[PDB]
């Protein structure tokens, strides 16, 4: 019993975190096989990040310019390439703790676990959702960049995130591990602002089902309704429209509880109108949207 914001164990990722130094610029890098992956603005000085050209900042640079410490050991850079906003340092030494891994591009709505690092040494782990506005409410300081986001299947680490920058609202922007930013952002200190953030509807609906499974039922009613009509009412609290795919993936949780998805939407509606009346759900006083159906099935069943 219980429901808690729960990260993947971080061991496998911990064994791949190195620091990358270039000039007096330092951040974290991802050591998989004989390649380290890191954010490219490591090649930047403080003096040349208002408006940089990376394709030459790299031609201006040499293997020997790249320092990679893997705890005690230094790693010899025998090659470098750039692919979008990430650097790929080839190194003389395959990571002997390399786990099974894929690289994946996740959707707005999907969760991952973030191993936060400083100077290549891992600091802490926490669960994050990719917001609809393609940012994440993370907890990062100076030297957090190259910290990665991941999901583990059994023993397969899928890397979906690498960390670059902090928007001026306290939320975070990064790339996949092919270096393509999530959302319309770019790695330079020009004026950027996130598109206004929607709520992850399906996620809150999975989070209600999670609360039923742990006892809290008070927010339920005999009211059912029409997807289109619940949508018309969601579009009025900044909820993303809920698709017919979104209903399908709640299918399992709707089964285990006997509460039909449409019925839970009417439960969501009546919450948004009247609020929680100084009540709690799963220990929270507001509707939590950073929990995927999978997140919840993973905790609540076996």
């Amino acid at each position: 019993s219980g429901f808690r914001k729960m990260a993947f164990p971080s061991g496998k990722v911990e064994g791949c975190m190195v620091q990358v130094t270039c000039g007096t610029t330092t951040l974290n890098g991802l050591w998989l096989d004989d390649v380290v992956y890191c954010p490219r603005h490591v090649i930047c000085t403080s003096e040349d990040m208002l408006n940089p050209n990376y394709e030459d900042l790299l031609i201006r640079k040499s293997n020997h310019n790249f320092l990679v410490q893997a705890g005690n050991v230094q790693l010899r850079v025998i090659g470098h390439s750039m692919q979008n906003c990430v650097l790929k340092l080839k190194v003389d030494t395959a990571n002997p703790k390399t786990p099974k891994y894929k690289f994946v591009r996740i959707q707005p709505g999907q969760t991952f676990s973030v191993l936060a690092c400083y100077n290549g040494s891992p600091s802490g782990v926490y669960q994050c959702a990719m917001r609809p506005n393609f940012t994440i409410k993370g907890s990062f300081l100076n030297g957090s960049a190259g910290s990665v986001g991941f999901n583990i299947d059994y023993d397969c680490v899928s890397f979906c995130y690498m960390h670059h920058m902090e928007l001026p609202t306290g939320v975070h922007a990064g790339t996949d591990l092919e270096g393509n930013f999530y959302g319309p952002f770019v790695d330079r200190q020009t004026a950027q602002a996130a598109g206004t953030d929607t709520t992850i509807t399906v996620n809150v609906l999975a989070w209600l089902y999670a609360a039923v499974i742990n006892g809290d039922r008070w927010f339920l009613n005999r009211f059912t309704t029409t997807l289109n009509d619940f949508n018309l009412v969601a579009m009025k609290y900044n909820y993303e429209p809920l698709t017919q795919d979104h209903v399908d993936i709640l299918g399992p949780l709707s089964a285990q509880t006997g509460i039909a998805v449409l019925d839970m939407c009417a439960s969501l509606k009546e919450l948004l109108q009247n609020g929680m009346n100084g009540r709690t759900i799963l220990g929270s006083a507001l509707l939590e949207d950073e929990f995927t159906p999978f997140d919840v099935v993973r905790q609540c069943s076996g």
Partner: peptide, 8 residues
């Protein structure tokens, strides 16, 4: 916007 490398 802040890039979260250490530039010191």
């Amino acid at each position: 916007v802040k890039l979260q490398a250490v530039f010191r």
